[PDB]
Structures are given as C-alpha cells and as structure tokens.
C-alpha cells in the first residue's frame, strides 16, 4: 500500500546539435572466469535486445601466459614451480548506433562489469569530407 | 498584550515599505513564528499573513503551513477552527513538489500529521502521507526523532479507523522498514485485532514484539496473556 | 622504515636520478650525435661526468619491494620468487594458478 | 464556508511589479549567508535509502568515476591545440 | 614434499575452513580467488600497486579488527570502488562493529582516494569444513 504516488522522471533535453552515428560499437571484455562472462553476454545480449540494438556475439581465442619459478629458497635448480594467467575474451559487437544510444548502452554495461573483468570498447564514427577537401583550392 | 506587540510589528512593516525594502520569505516566517505565544488572539491576524503572502508574490513554504498549523492546534477542542484550516492546506499543497526555502521546512509532516490523530481523520492522513510520498517530498519528514513521531501517530491512526485487513497491511509495509515500533503501537496493534475477532495473529505479534526490542515490557506481556485468556 | 639499508640507498638512487634525468638528457643529446663539433662534445662529455654518481640511471637495482632481495625478482609484480609465491599460493593475487599442460 | 485564502490582508506592503529582475551575480558570501545556505542542505537531509543513492552522492561528490568511461576525464593537457 | 599453503594431517583435532583444508593445486579447480581485479589480465596494468594495496588492505583489517576475523577477507574492486567482504565473529558488541566500520572505511578512503565499503557477515563460530 505504501508506495509512492508520482515520481520524478530525469531531465533529458534534446539538444540543437546533430548527434553521432557510430557504424560500430566492439565491446571485447576481458576476463579469468569464463562462466562469468557467459552471465555477463546474456546480460549485455538482452539488455540490447530491449533496447532495439543490433547485436552479434563471438569468442576469440584464449590466451595463456606460462612462466616459471623455483621451487626452493636456495639451491635445488632442477625443481621448479610453474604458474600461469589465463585471459578468456568475449566480444559484443553492436551496429548502426547512434552517439546518444551508445552512451546510455555502455554506461549502463560498464557500470555492472563484474569485478575481475575489463573492457575495451572499440567505436567506429561516421564522418562527412571536411569542406576544405571537397574541391582543390585551383 | 497582543494588541501592543501587533501595532509594534505592523509600524516595522510599515517602516520596512518606507526605506523601499521588500519582505522575503523568511519576514512572514518570522511574524507566524513568533505568534504561536498569542495563540487564540493571533489566529485571525495570523491568517492575514497567509493572505499577505500570497498577494505579493511570496509563496509560503512547508514552514509557512507548520507555523499556521501549531498556532491553530491549540489544546482544546481542534473542531471548531483546526478542521478546515488542514482540510483547506491540503487542498492547496495537493500535488506539488516542495523545495528547501526556511529551515523549518522539515517541521509540517510532523506538525500536519499531529492533527490528524487529534481530528482522528484517517481520509486526511491519507492525504498528508500521499504528499510526502508524490515526488522527492519524502525528505521533508526530519530527522529521526520527527520521522518516529509521524510513523508513530500514523500507523495508531490506522490501526484504530482502518480495516483489519489493510492494517496488517501498513503494518507490513511500515514496520521495520520504515521505523520501529514502540511499546504503545503494539498495544493499539493488539487491541485492532480485538476487534476484528482475529487472535489467531496473537502469536505473530508476539514474535515481533521480541524482535521490536519490547520482550521485558510489563504493559506488554499482560495485554497479550489477558487477550489470549 | 624501509627493509634494509640496501633497499634505502636504491630508494635515494631513484630519487637523485629522477631529479637529473631532464639535465643528463639534454647533455646526452649534444654527445650522441655527428653535427656538433667535436669542441663542443668533449665539454659535454666532461659536464655530464662531473654529475653526481648516483644520478646516473644504470645503477638503480630493481629489488623485491617486501624483502629487498635483488634476484629472482618478478617485474610485473615487483616481487622476489619467494614472496610472489606466497600470496600465489593462498589464492591472493587475482587470475593467478599453478599451471599444468 | 469561506476559504482561508479569501478575506482581509494586512495592506501594507504592495504586489511586486515583478521578481527582481536583474541579480546581484557578485554578492559577497558573508558569513550569514554562507550559513543560511547550510541550514536549507539540513532540512532535505536524510540518510541513503538504497544502493543506487549511494552511488548518486558519491557522483555528485566526486568520489565515483563518470560513466560511460572517458581515459581522459579531467586530463585537459591546458587547453593546447595539435598544432602547438 | 611440498609444504607451501598446506595444513598437515594431525591427529583429528585440528579444524580447518574450507580455504585452509586446499593446496595450491586446487587454485581455479576447487577453490576461487581471494582478490579480483583486471591487473593480471593480458595487456592490463597496474598489477604492481593493486597486489601493495592488497597486502596491506589484509594487514590493516587483522589488526582493525583483532579477534574477530572468521576467514580471510575477499577483496573485489569495480571501477574505483574497492569492497572488501569480511566474515567476522558474534562476540563484540555491535556497537563496536559499527564504529570499526565507519573508522575503517573512511581511513581507507582517505589513503587510497576512492570510495571504499565494507561488508560484514557474522557467524556464530568459525566454520568447520573438516578435522585433520
Ligand atoms: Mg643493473
Ligand atoms: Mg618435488
């Protein structure tokens, strides 16, 4: 019963300048964890899905990076300890994006990157011809 | 006596229009504030305030209404005069969202609430909880101590003119969201369930009167055993 | 309150030659190249040896930041093979597993 | 039958003509208006309700980073242009 | 034979935690991490003064906090937030927990400059997974 009656909306004010097209947006997390970034590929997936976001989903390959270590404080060189880091990837690419959906899009991604997990998003604008290039100055 | 400090206070007015100095918010807050002494002999020329506000182009605040409210909620008997003076504030802060304009802004939920008890109108606290919840009003409840003190005279006032079932209701949505009971709002509590020929809840309120801090109350326990015996 | 004061002489040869580092680059300029003359050069050679000793870069040590030890020192983590190992194997540094294949 | 916002009022002062039009942009902050303006931050004071007004005043303060994320937030190199 | 991070058979006596009762060998197959951040990924950086923060982020909460700690802390960090996830005892009073609370987690943010929280969890005694 007790619940609120109105509520106050954030202001959005649309502006007098052109926004941004993106022809694409690559979301490639990063991650130790793969069944982490399988949650967070169905949450990205389905939050751009309600959006009205075009959206494709692949894995690029793994990496391991193996190094070694002694095993004893002194002497016995024959004996070693080896350790790895294991880096699984995932990458969201999305298209045909405005600037404006892109960034509410990303903020509300990158705001619930799980921890231990990073992002290197990748944006393709699309740009007129400068006008000093349209026509040679003779 | 009134009648000295009234021409005292209308010759700085007057005084304050002669040096081309115009009142703010606070000028009338001030003359409401210090009125609340004179009660009865105040509450017209209080009201000419209000009416003076409103005519300038100052808008009273959530203070203006609270220091309307205590010199109005006089002890004594409220149906004469502070009836219509809360029904006719509701009707004019209905649906509006407050900004913080006087310090004693957080100070009428409080004060407005109080008189609904008194009045024991369950429709007008319906509608001074539903303007403390329309927007961001909900922070103008005050500190702790105010937002007990409202909680507690609401939730008694439902339990007492309110159905059994939509009391069990505010009973969950409140408590302990919203605040802790005291002793006293489990007993009112208690005595709606009476009523409504409902003891099989007795153990229920038993359960939360131990997790509510009240397992050693005396008033308590010997309300409960009575009821169930 | 450093480890030791062997860690304390790297602290000081980290701090001198970060104070010199923007002088010894613009003497080093003047010597590394073949268009100044050679009078100019051999002044520059002199200037940049009459520095302080401990300005000069080569001498800085990277050591283990918990115990000091100047061997078996992981860059990454700045940390000796024996203390990495310590919070690898508690399941302290993040991503971080014994490896097998 | 009468409502409270119909009937006599003090007369004394007059309407505004209009809110004061032009403001005082660089009004000094005396120490009793600097004060004033603390008393009106502790009337809508009130503690954190839910995580996400944690996260507002923590924005509001600062303290947060800004979202989406900017590498180069706060990090105008003087206002310099390529060509310097 | 191994000895790191290994509590020794004994004589049936000795409870140990869950964490406690794995060797390093069990790190990502039975076992998760006490820390995540994005320092040791590929092409990340950093790593250095995250694994200094650490350390010190355990030694400070043992001696803040002494006698309580039930398990070791689970530091996990999103954006500039830092959490750091304690499973604490039931014997002081909550008064004094929430006045540790406060204490910590503002002189931490004041040390490291981001905000920092602290989430406790109580529990009647220490969890026993098994007695070596
Ligand atoms: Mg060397
Ligand atoms: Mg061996």
Same mark, same amino acid.
Request: net charge positive; hydrophobic share 40%.
């Given at each position: ?138 | ?229 | ?37 050679? =009078? ?41 093979? =024996? ?19 | ?84 | ?132």
């Amino acid at each position: 019963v007790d619940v609120p009656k109105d509520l106050t909306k954030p202001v959005v004010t649309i502006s007098d300048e052109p926004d941004i097209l993106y022809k694409r947006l690559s979301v490639l997390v990063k991650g130790h964890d793969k069944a982490v970034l399988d949650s967070y590929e169905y949450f990205a997936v389905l939050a751009a899905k309600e959006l009205g976001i075009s959206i494709k989903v692949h894995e690029p390959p793994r990496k391991i990076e193996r190094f070694t270590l002694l095993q004893s404080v002194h002497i016995y060189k024959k004996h070693r300890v080896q350790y790895e880091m294991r880096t699984l990837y995932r990458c969201l690419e999305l298209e045909h994006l405005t600037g404006s959906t892109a960034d509410v899009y990303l903020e509300y991604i990158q705001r619930n990157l799980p921890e231990g997990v990073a992002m290197e998003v990748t944006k393709t604008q699309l740009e007129q011809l400068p006008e000093h290039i349209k026509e040679p100055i003779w | 006596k009134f009648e000295e400090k009234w021409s005292k206070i209308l010759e700085l007015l007057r005084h304050m229009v002669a040096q081309k100095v115009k009142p703010n918010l606070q000028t009338f807050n001030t003359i409401l504030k210090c009125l609340r002494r004179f009660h009865v002999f105040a509450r017209s020329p209080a009201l000419q305030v209000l009416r003076e506000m409103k005519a300038i182009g100052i808008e009273p605040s959530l203070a203006t209404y609270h220091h309307i409210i205590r010199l109005f909620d006089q002890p004594g008997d409220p149906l004469k005069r502070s009836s219509f003076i809360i029904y006719d504030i509701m009707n004019e802060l209905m649906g509006k969202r407050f900004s913080p304009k006087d310090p004693d802004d957080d100070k009428f939920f409080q004060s407005a609430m109080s008189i609904c008890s008194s009045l024991r109108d369950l429709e007008l606290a319906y509608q001074v909880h539903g303007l403390l919840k329309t927007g961001d009003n909900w922070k103008f409840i005050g500190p702790d101590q105010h937002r007990n003190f409202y909680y507690s005279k609401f939730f008694d006032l439902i339990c007492l003119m309110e159905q059994i079932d939509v009391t069990l209701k505010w009973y969950e949505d409140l408590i302990p969201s919203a605040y802790f009971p005291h002793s006293q709002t489990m007993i009112h509590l208690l005595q709606a369930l009476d009523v409504a020929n409902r003891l099989e809840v007795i153990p229920k309120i038993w359960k939360d009167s131990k997790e509510y801090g009240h397992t050693f109350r005396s008033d308590l326990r010997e309300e409960i055993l009575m009821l169930m015996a | 309150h450093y480890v030791d004061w062997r860690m304390w002489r790297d602290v000081k040869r980290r701090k001198m030659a970060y104070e010199y580092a923007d002088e010894r680059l613009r003497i080093n300029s003047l010597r590394k190249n073949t268009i100044l003359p050679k =009078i100019l050069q051999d002044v520059a050679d002199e200037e940049i040896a009459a520095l302080p000793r401990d300005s000069c870069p080569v001498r800085i040590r990277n050591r283990c930041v918990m115990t000091s030890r100047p061997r078996g020192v992981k860059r990454r983590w700045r940390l000796s093979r =024996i203390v990495f190992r310590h919070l690898a194997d508690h399941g302290q540094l993040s991503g971080i597993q014994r490896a097998t294949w | 039958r009468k409502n409270i916002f119909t009937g006599k009022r003090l007369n004394i002062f007059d309407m505004m003509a209009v809110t004061k039009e032009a403001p005082e942009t660089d009004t000094s902050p005396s120490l009793w208006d600097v004060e004033f303006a603390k008393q009106l931050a502790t009337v809508n004071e009130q503690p954190l309700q839910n995580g996400f007004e944690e996260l507002i005043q923590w924005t509001k303060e600062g303290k947060l980073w800004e979202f989406p994320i900017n590498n180069e937030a706060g990090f105008d190199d003087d206002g310099s242009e390529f060509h310097e | 034979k191994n000895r790191a991070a290994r509590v020794r058979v004994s004589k049936g006596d000795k409870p140990v935690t869950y964490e406690e009762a794995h060797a390093p060998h069990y790190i990502a197959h039975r076992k998760g991490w006490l820390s995540l951040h994005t320092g040791n990924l590929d092409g990340e950086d950093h790593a250095a003064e995250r694994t200094v923060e650490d350390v010190f982020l355990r030694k400070f909460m043992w001696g803040t906090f002494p006698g309580c700690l039930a398990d070791q802390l689970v530091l996990k960090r999103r954006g500039n937030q830092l959490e750091i996830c304690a499973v604490v005892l039931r014997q002081l009073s909550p008064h004094k927990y929430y006045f540790l609370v406060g204490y910590s987690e503002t002189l931490l943010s004041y040390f490291y400059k981001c905000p920092v929280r602290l989430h406790l969890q109580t529990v009647p005694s220490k969890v026993v997974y098994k007695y070596l």
